[PDB]
Ligand binder design. Structure first.
Ligand code: ACO
Ligand code: ACO
Lengths: 415, 415
């Protein structure tokens, strides 16, 4: 068995935020029916194709295990099919522009009358209360609005976006949490409900530690662990701190052998408070162990970049992998800056099911990120992503439509 | 009613990854018992205190609504209390260093025998088959190992960490998804199971789009939307792309009025493919609408920074908020780079329950990030974080211990 065996999901989504959520639902055992505009489909099918004329990787990596129907929900037949789908489903997920699903006639209020058990999940750029409620959002728009761009990068550079999908997949994972909680809640109430997740809120959740810092800054006028302390200055808002420890212990990105020509010849190195003695032994600085300028985090902070420079005198001499193999013998929290090339080929990531090779029709093999959490009682089976409208007939037949009704829908461009 | 009403959780966690997960469980209605080392407690209680002698904000913003017991699980009594707790609980969550819980005698195999219905959630830096399985991890160590640091920042600068908790809270949210799925699964099987989540995998999941790019790069030798195309060069790994669109449409961080003195006087600006005409009207370049050098994404790419420079001629003249109010009239996806100060005071974020003022004993008011997703059938009630061992006696009494038994535990330093 699987966690969501028997659950039916209507995936009325596109791009990344909504589809990441429903892909996980499929991997958990749900029947996910992706509802797509006839002849067009999810925009990711056509975006940044590496092979002409077939679905792009953007699509296949976000839509594994789903079924695809082509349905124009703006036609009379399409609206009726949508209603029948809603009546039979457990979950409906959508991430179209603000107002879009409403204008089709499928407001939450209507969805509720059709099926009081249905859970309706909606992703938008911003909350209902926001002055930006009607604003379209992509990944980095949310990173700017949610606090991440403000606090990422260097103090003497611009705000910087993260490569990680803070606005997209992150929001999808947050919606997923809400959908699973709503399924658990429905076990008690017998009713569905609406779950909304904004991209701004998803980014803010991950920036909780910077809201901690803002409050410390408001109270004290300084942030004792930030690069700016004590020889720099603070303004009224949490500043960018380069490669500082953030929510972790103090640390930095350090150069390893090759850094001049290899943009990934680096490690992250943590000075863990309770590990100062082992840290000193690792770098051959026994004299620093009890020296009062070095023996506490507070005393190190005003010359911490001298300390990092000293560690770097060692790390630039060996490959990042060697540097880590050595330093971890001293219980130092560190790791190489792994490139996507190293990740894509890493045997341990294949073994754990974190990077998964999947065979797609026409394309053949591709890699995707697998189900990130591991369960002792079940293993997701990750499959190909659907061809556009591959399952239209089957889905309509499951709803009880006859061959004549389906032929009429095709003639009327409802499918 | 609440989603997790009646669920009992043992929170054997510290710092940020584990505690973020169990805080959400508490907000969903679970009884979350935080198990803490006597006389010490979670390290976040004393990290970066802004008020002398009381719990730090790092702790209060991650431990709302929880109960706290002091229990030394290395003593004979403490082991027996832990066993009774496990027998009565639904979920046990831990994020101690690799091996730590095992060495106390609470391996998964033993947990299972005590209570076959219990779901055991475990966070570690790396997966079981990783060469780094025993390595300690903080936030940025995971960002380095998971692909984010490699691909974040500028092409001519170092790898850069994100301010967002990609390794910590993100991992907690991923574990939470697994725990909720396991509760749903247990409805079918009648059994608990083990759910494990590594910080490296959590980061990788959010970097799914960069694994897409790595495969495109492997096939083609170039990435047509990256800043390096077509006038720069590509190596064998996905490079850093500065403030480029990433998973979203092409875009950049643009200066607004005040940028020379205000590190947050900026917006993110998206050139949405289907919006080129409105974009041109917005900036007073009607001549660019059908000009073949400008009218498609492909034609714009080779001189896209000249286009951003031209937009910046407008944005530097107005404050970021005014820039956005104007540009959104043209259906342009954009938003200001909001500072943590702006976020902390934003009335709409108070109204949506995204930033929540909570009253803590002794401290008084503080702000926290609320429950990020919104539910139509219930509203989380966010409360204070527990004082160390505040609930020890109540928890032991609930387990059936007499006053003499509790007194003996105190004498024997079990509590
Ligand atoms: C990958 C990431 O997800 S990136 C960020 C994604 N963003 C979000 O999730 C936040 C909310 N979504 C949005 O803001 C927007 O969907 C955007 C910005 C991503 C894209 O917006 P746009 O491309 O301009 O339009 P969008 O795809 O949402 O909708 C286009 C139209 O298709 C219609 N549509 C969608 N499915 C169907 C269908 N099956 N049949 C007929 N019409 C359909 C919509 O109703 C809309 O028409 P309308 O404007 O007449 O009401
Ligand atoms: C900001 C951040 O970046 S948070 C990072 C969080 N990391 C994770 O979640 C991944 C897994 N965790 C780790 O790698 C580690 O816990 C770290 C690196 C965060 C810290 O590690 P450490 O220096 O070992 O401290 P940690 O709190 O895990 O170990 C505590 C010790 O207390 C013990 N302990 C914990 N609770 C109790 C208790 N109630 N009674 C008695 N002992 C206890 C542990 O068993 C361990 O003892 P041991 O070394 O004799 O086996």
């Amino acid at each position: 068995s699987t966690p969501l065996q028997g659950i039916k999901v209507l995936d009325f989504t596109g791009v990344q935020s909504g589809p990441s959520c429903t892909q996980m639902l499929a991997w958990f055992g749900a029947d996910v029916i992706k509802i797509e505009r006839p002849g067009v489909g999810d925009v990711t099918r056509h975006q940044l194709r590496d092979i002409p004329d077939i679905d792009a990787l953007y699509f296949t990596m976000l839509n594994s295990n789903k079924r695809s129907i082509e349905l124009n929900t703006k036609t009379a037949e399409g609206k009726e099919v949508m209603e029948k789908l809603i009546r039979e489903a457990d979950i409906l997920v959508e991430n179209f522009h603000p107002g879009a699903i409403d204008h089709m006639g499928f407001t939450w209020e209507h969805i509720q009358e059709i099926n009081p058990r249905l859970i309706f999940g909606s992703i938008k750029g911003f909350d209902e209360c926001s002055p930006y409620v009607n604003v379209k959002a992509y990944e980095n728009v949310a990173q700017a609005a949610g606090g991440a761009a403000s606090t990422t990068g260097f103090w003497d550079g611009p705000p910087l976006v993260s490569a990680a999908a803070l606005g997209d997949s992150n929001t999808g994972m947050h919606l997923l949490i809400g959908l699973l909680a709503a399924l658990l809640h429905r076990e008690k109430t017998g009713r569905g409900q609406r779950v909304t997740m904004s991209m701004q809120d998803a980014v803010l959740n991950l920036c909780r530690v910077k809201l901690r810092d803002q409050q410390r800054l408001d109270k004290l006028g300084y942030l004792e662990e930030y690069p700016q302390y004590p020889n720099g200055t603070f303004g009224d808002a949490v500043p960018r701190g380069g490669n500082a420890g953030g929510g972790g212990q103090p640390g930095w990105i350090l150069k390893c052998k090759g850094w001049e020509t290899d943009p990934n010849a680096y490690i992250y190195f943590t000075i863990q408070e309770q590990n100062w003695e082992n840290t000193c032994k690792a770098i051959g600085k026994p004299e620093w162990i009890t020296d009062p300028a070095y023996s506490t985090a507070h005393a190190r902070q005003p010359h911490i970049f001298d300390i990092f420079a000293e560690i770097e005198k060692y790390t630039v001499t060996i490959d990042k992998h060697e540097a880590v193999a050595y330093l971890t013998q001293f219980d130092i929290p560190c790791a190489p800056v792994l490139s996507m090339k190293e990740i894509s080929l890493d045997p341990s990531l294949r073994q754990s099911g974190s990077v998964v090779e999947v065979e797609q029709p026409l394309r053949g093999k591709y890699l995707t990120v697998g189900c990130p959490m591991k369960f002792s009682a079940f293993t997701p089976d990750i499959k190909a992503a659907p061809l556009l409208g591959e399952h239209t007939a089957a889905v309509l037949q499951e709803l009880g439509y006859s061959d004549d009704e389906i032929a009429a829908m095709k003639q009327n461009h409802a499918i």
